[PDB]
Design the sequence.
């Protein structure tokens, strides 16, 4: 009947229609000829204005004053500002709304049930790399909260015409070093080889552990990036042990508490925030499956399987599956023991299903990237696997941006 | 124009140029991607061009493009369509077409096997009774005492203004699902509807969890007929577990032969509404989806309790632990019974090789990531880390409406 994508849940037999996708102003990578959904990575005053008008409309709607005098005056104010400066500036509450809407709009995030609970730190007054470090340390302190983790974003000054960007060079605020060895292998996190060598080129004295916390490379406008070492007491980590396998603790594994992505671009109303780090808490599979077991990450699956005395000589023993499960259990158990916020992939996907239903009512749909939403272990054991999803780009948005170097 | 395809484990990059050969629209648009949807929302010059294109594919395959035989065949097809509005395939063309359709199936992880397919021509079928004989032979051939062999049986194509030949069941072997009035379902819930259709067409039902359904076979414009498969034809594997002695006591089992029977085979514009095909199972289909899906046999909690796991909380990973043991039991049991089966690691590893073979052969390979990646231990398999391009090539297997 309805001229909108029909979305089915095959577990429950229920049907919805996504009408929200009609609000998408930006094309993705797919066409009627081929679907590129699995691909990881696929102003003129006029363009800015329409984006800005769209956002201001979004803002006034969200506060139920659409069509009002203050709405029309804000529109006039934004246009006039662009008229004389080529850009414009957000009011504080507009920044807060946009930051939250960016998260709410993120198709790849399974944690969006939490989207309304986001502490927005306005750092648009920051004017140095040293000052960025202060703001970041404060973010880490607040967000970590001794293990009772709190979602937060710190927004630094927006991209400005004829002036360099504020950039955090590191992909997350907390990252383990990856040291390339003489034998070609990697000690530490192979994901972080490039940033590690960049840190060294910039005067960092490197360690040689598997879990050396990297220093921050922070870049203020039109300046070389400066190197900042995080005070270790600010960086909460959890040593990994297993509830029953006593040898697991002897592996010396660990992960940091705070997932704090820092290389993403926050776009709101056409304004571009090139440095706006944000953090929540981990879903246990990110650490236990991906970071610890990916072939091109720590790759600990065989080591653990051997300790479990599994038959690693044949696929059909399911040694990989068994080990992966116990590694994930260790992550959950250790985070719980340490009283550091974490969520398993069952609890998380269940809560995302609740989120989908909320957004169905609130907005007529929810953009979602099935491949990213479904967890990397136990896929069909979670409800989201059986849930069809429509993927599309809404704005405000978090966007990938090229590396500053 | 041409999609850049990256593998994130190895850093390697391909470019898919095969997708330019797609003549059929999928469900995605620039505005929104619908790749996770399971089913699609919904003259003679058209047929003639699909026909020419296919005959072209065929003669290129035998390396005789531009040969007089190729040219003569094109005129044959053209002459037949111009006169009758349709045409017919030579057996050798049908055999090529069927293999290509498997090859082009974006959702199939087992396509490394594509060139190895026994094709039974059943186009000289005029009755449900004859369909039954062909089906029995197919099952006999394909089962081969546990040494499974991939096969397809092809029934007469669709004709204008005439009902279709159809097999009503979704697979040649399916377990009954009986809806007990107390809300529940005994058996396989996926088969409630087909079970009920069977009963209304005269089948005396069982009352078990693994009662093998009769086939409802339909010749054109006739009511379907009921046929009970001879039990000796249907090979089943009792499930036990290598170390957990109690597992066998669950009374679990599954059939050897996965033989899908409700898909339509399109070749060169011609449509074969009844063309059942079979290979062998990947263990996760049985151990994860069929046995553990909440809307299937849903045995997770039962197994977990037997393993004395803490069911109270999600964070004990009782679901993940139980699922792994069930998958192991399926593998163990099939191996013990000498019945062909492939685990999801072996399967996905061979699929990566297939992607590589196809890159060299055709310049790409249509694949549906969401279906290729197994339902447990996704990122533990190489396909998780492989970008894939999805699109429709012909010959193709397609979904079609239920005939009732
Ligand atoms: C509060 C608890 C949260 C949980 C459990 C959570 C969970 C996740 C997970 C599992 C992913 C997939 C990441 C990967 O596989 O690498 C993800 C992605 C993402 N998250 Fe959330 N998240 C949370 C909070 C947040 C917050 C506070 C923000 C921003 C305000 C956010 C924005 C995003 C974005 C933009 C992505 C996509 C990343 C990409 O494409 O690279 N998340 N999230
Ligand atoms: C020989 C061993 C084979 C293996 C191990 C295998 C594996 C699989 C698996 C795991 C799926 C996903 C099915 C599901 O989740 O329900 C699938 C789908 C599919 N397979 Fe294969 N397969 C094999 C042979 C074949 C053959 C012989 C054909 C046809 C001649 C075929 C054509 C297809 C098609 C068309 C689909 C998609 C069905 C749909 O979209 O619902 N496969 N295969
Ligand atoms: C393109 N950058 C890839 C990349 C993504 C990363 O994480 C994505 C991401 C983003 C936001 C998250 C929020 C919460 C959470 N638990 N995980 C989250 C994970 C981390 C490092 C890199 Cl290098
Ligand atoms: C309409 N229901 C869809 C459906 C799809 C099914 O599987 C598709 C399918 C097709 C070919 C296969 C080949 C081999 C294999 N192991 N599984 C295969 C699975 C099975 C039953 C049903 Cl009921
Ligand atoms: C090729 C594929 O898109 C890629 O490996 C994706 C798949 N799904 C994912 N899902 C999440 N949550 N995170 C990821 O990094 C990925 N990687
Ligand atoms: C909604 C989602 O697309 C649906 O559950 C799909 C996901 N991937 C799948 N993959 C396979 N192999 N088989 C399936 O039935 C499905 N179902
Ligand atoms: Zn798509």
Sequence:
């Amino acid at each position: 009947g309805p001229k909108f994508p029909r979305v089915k849940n095959w577990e429950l037999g229920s049907i919805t229609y996504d009408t929200l996708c009609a609000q998408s102003q930006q094309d993705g990578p797919c066409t009627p000829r081929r679907c590129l959904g699995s691909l990881v990575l696929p102003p003129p005053a006029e363009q800015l204005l329409s984006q800005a008008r769209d956002f201001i409309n979004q803002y006034y709607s969200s506060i139920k004053r659409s069509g009002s005098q203050a709405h029309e005056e804000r529109l006039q104010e934004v246009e006039a500002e662009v008229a004389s400066t080529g850009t414009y500036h957000l009011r504080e509450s507009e920044l807060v709304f946009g930051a939250k809407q960016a998260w709410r709009n993120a198709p790849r995030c399974v944690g969006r049930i939490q989207w309304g609970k986001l502490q927005v730190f306005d750092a648009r007054d920051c004017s140095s790399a040293q000052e960025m470090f202060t703001y970041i340390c404060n973010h880490i302190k607040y967000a970590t909260n001794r293990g009772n983790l709190r979602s937060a974003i710190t927004v630094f000054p927006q991209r400005a015409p004829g002036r360099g960007d504020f950039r955090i060079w590191n992909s997350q605020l907390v990252r383990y070093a990856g040291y390339r060895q003489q034998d070609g292998s990697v000690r530490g996190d192979p994901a972080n080889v490039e940033i590690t060598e960049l840190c060294i080129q910039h005067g960092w004295t490197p360690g040689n552990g598997r879990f050396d916390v990297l220093p921050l490379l922070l870049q203020a406008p039109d300046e070389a990036p400066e190197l900042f070492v995080l005070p270790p007491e600010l960086v909460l980590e959890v040593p990994l042990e297993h509830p029953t396998l006593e040898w697991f603790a002897a592996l010396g594994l660990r992960w940091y508490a705070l997932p704090a992505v820092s290389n993403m671009l926050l776009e709101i109303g056409g304004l571009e925030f090139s440095a706006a780090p944000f953090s929540g808490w981990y879903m246990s599979t990110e650490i236990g499956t991906r970071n610890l077991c990916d072939p091109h990450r720590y790759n600990i699956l065989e080591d653990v399987a051997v300790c479990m005395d599994l038959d690693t000589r044949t696929t059909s023993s399911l040694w990989k599956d068994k080990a992966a499960v116990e590694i994930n259990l260790a992550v959950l158990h250790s985070f719980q023991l340490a009283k550091v916020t974490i969520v398993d992939h069952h609890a998380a996907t269940v809560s995302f299903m609740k989120h989908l239903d909320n957004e169905q009512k609130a907005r007529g749909g929810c953009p979602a990237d099935w491949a990213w939403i479904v967890p990397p272990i136990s896929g069909s054991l979670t409800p989201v696997f059986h849930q069809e999803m429509v993927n599309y780009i809404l704005s405000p948005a978090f966007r990938y941006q090229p590396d500053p170097w």
